[PDB]
Amino acid sequence: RGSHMADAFVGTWKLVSSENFDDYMKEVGVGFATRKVAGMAKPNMIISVNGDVITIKSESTFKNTEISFILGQEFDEVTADDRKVKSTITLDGGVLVHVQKWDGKSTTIKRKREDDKLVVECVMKGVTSTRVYERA
Numbered sequence: 611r612g613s614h615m616a617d618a619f620v621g622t623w624k625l626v627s628s629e630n631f632d633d634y635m636k637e638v639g640v641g642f643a644t645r646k647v648a649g650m651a652k653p654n655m656i657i658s659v660n661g662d663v664i665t666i667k668s669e670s671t672f673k674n675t676e677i678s679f680i681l682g683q684e685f686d687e688v689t690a691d692d693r694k695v696k697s698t699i700t701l702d703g704g705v706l707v708h709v710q711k712w713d714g715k716s717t718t719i720k721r722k723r724e725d726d727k728l729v730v731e732c733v734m735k736g737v738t739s740t741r742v743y744e745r746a
């Protein structure tokens with residue numbers, strides 16, 4: 611197999627900045643103690659592609675998570691804050707768009723390459739958090 615469109619995301623990334631993430635978690639419904647501990651985390655993100663399967667791992671002092679998925683195909687995900695959600699991830703003009711649905715709620719996580727950074731935009735009902743990763 612040759613190059614994949616998600617290949618621009620492949621690599622090991624480290625969180626270098628975060629804005630409004632506490633407010634975002636509040637809007638998602640995250641409880642106090644989880645918000646405080648999760649907000650301290652400086653996770654590493656490891657993204658790989660094998661054929662049609664994309665894997666995104668997050669390693670931190672808070673939790674280690676891993677999702678593997680095929681674009682456009684819904685899957686089960688247990689989030690770092692231990693929500694049990696139904697997730698679909700697609701590629702839209704070079705942006706990975708991740709929708710999570712649970713308990714009649716929805717949130718959208720967009721991951722995009724900007725310069726040498728991986729920028730993560732987390733949106734819930736008007737609240738947006740921007741998390742910036744650099745190569746590790």
Ligand SMILES: O=C(O)c1ccccc1Nc1ccccc1
Pocket residue numbers: 625648649651653668670672673690719730732741
């Ligand atoms: O950093 C992200 O892209 C991110 C986006 C949405 C939810 C969680 C996220 N990461 C994370 C948060 C706390 C502990 C460990 C990892």
